Design an enzyme around this catalytic site. Structure first.
Site: not given
Ligand SMILES: COc1cc(-c2cncc(-c3ccc(C4CCN(C)CC4)cc3)c2C)cc(OC)c1OC
Ligand SMILES: COc1cc(-c2cncc(-c3ccc(C4CCN(C)CC4)cc3)c2C)cc(OC)c1OC
Ligand SMILES: COc1cc(-c2cncc(-c3ccc(C4CCN(C)CC4)cc3)c2C)cc(OC)c1OC
Length: 283
Positions: A16, A18, A34, A133
């Protein structure tokens, strides 16, 4: 002693403005990394400053591991390293899953628990924090069916919010910027929208709604500030409560709850603590 800092970046789970989020491995353990864009460096500084002030530890707050700044030839590289939640965001999870009464209540009560933890000042302890947010993309689903709140890049202790989730006083610029409670009231508004997004996916009498984002029926994708102000401030529209909820005692109690998050008057809105109590008395 060896300080193991290598993180293997295995898969990009988010991209994104971000920057990017990666599933990574540290000492055989999944972490989320991140990597901030230059555009969003202030979010890395604010989250880092907050955690340097208070090491938040709560089962419904995304688990902090590290802030890293690495010197590059021409640039600075900024990483936030957290717990990894393989089921992904509530936003993603609601697309492809319906809920029963127990799992719907467990989700919204775990979000309310994380939000009340942010909001409450503890002497000795933690300052009061407002998220600013809150939305279903900033909430992660854990394997035990509880959620945790992510992204404290806009957090305030005692960039602007996603426009779709902005409270009326933010859209019409009447928010009392000097009053900390103003920012808690903004989070409660956004909590009410998240509650509506989840409640739609809870099955009752064989019926469920399709996943939709708040105000899907009255604003475009990437709604403008003006688009949102006309809907929320001028017309005072609120998300539709479907008739079918009124046949279900849980959805009826959740309708009442979300209405009490959506008052035009910020000071009339429920506190995170009152939402928590109400949710524990439901079912
Ligand atoms: C909102 O923000 C933040 C989020 C995260 C974060 C932590 N655990 C897991 C996720 C994630 C994992 C996997 C999927 C999908 C991909 C595979 N499949 C299609 C299903 C699952 C989506 C999301 C994230 C994005 C970390 C952050 O910081 C390091 C964030 O920012 C503060
Ligand atoms: C610099 O950077 C990163 C470091 C680490 C990391 C790796 N091994 C061990 C550690 C460790 C923890 C704590 C102590 C204590 C020992 C007792 N004493 C009284 C105070 C100090 C020492 C060492 C760390 C912090 C991981 C990272 O990422 C996951 C780092 O970021 C890339
Ligand atoms: C950042 O993250 C992680 C770090 C570590 C890790 C690695 N070396 C040493 C430590 C450590 C040892 C001892 C103390 C304290 C205990 C006694 N006190 C009185 C003073 C000193 C603190 C820290 C840690 C915590 C492991 C992790 O998980 C396996 C981490 O998470 C990814």
């Amino acid at each position: 002693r060896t300080v193991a800092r290598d993180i293997t970046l295995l898969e990009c789970v988010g991209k994104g403005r971000y920057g990017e989020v990666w599933r990574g491995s540290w000492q055989g353990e999944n972490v989320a990394v991140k990597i901030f864009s230059s555009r969003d460096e202030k979010s890395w500084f604010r989250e880092t400053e907050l955690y340097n002030t208070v090491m938040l530890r709560h089962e419904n707050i995304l688990g902090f591991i590290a802030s890293d700044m690495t010197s590059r030839h021409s640039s600075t590289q900024l990483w936030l390293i957290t717990h990894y939640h393989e089921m992904g965001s509530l936003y993603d999870y609601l697309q492809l899953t319906t809920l029963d009464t127990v799992s719907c209540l467990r989700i919204v009560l775990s979000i309310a628990s994380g939000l009340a933890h942010l909001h409450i000042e503890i002497f000795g302890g933690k300052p009061a924090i407002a998220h600013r947010d809150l939305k279903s993309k900033n909430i992660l689903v854990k394997k035990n069916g509880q959620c945790c709140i992510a992204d404290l890049g806009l957090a305030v202790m005692h960039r602007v919010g996603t426009k779709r989730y902005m409270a009326p006083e933010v859209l019409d610029e009447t928010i009392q910027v000097d009053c900390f409670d103003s920012y808690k009231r903004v989070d409660i508004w956004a909590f009410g929208l998240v509650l509506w997004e989840v409640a739609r996916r809870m099955v009752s009498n064989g019926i469920v709604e399709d996943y939709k984002p708040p105000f899907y029926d009255v604003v475009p994708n990437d709604p403008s500030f003006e688009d949102m102000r006309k809907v929320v401030c001028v017309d005072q529209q609120r998300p539709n409560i479907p008739n079918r909820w009124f046949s279900d005692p849980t959805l009826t109690s959740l309708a009442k709850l979300m209405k009490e998050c959506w008052y035009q008057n910020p000071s009339a809105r429920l506190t995170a603590l009152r939402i928590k109590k109400t949710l524990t008395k439901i079912d």
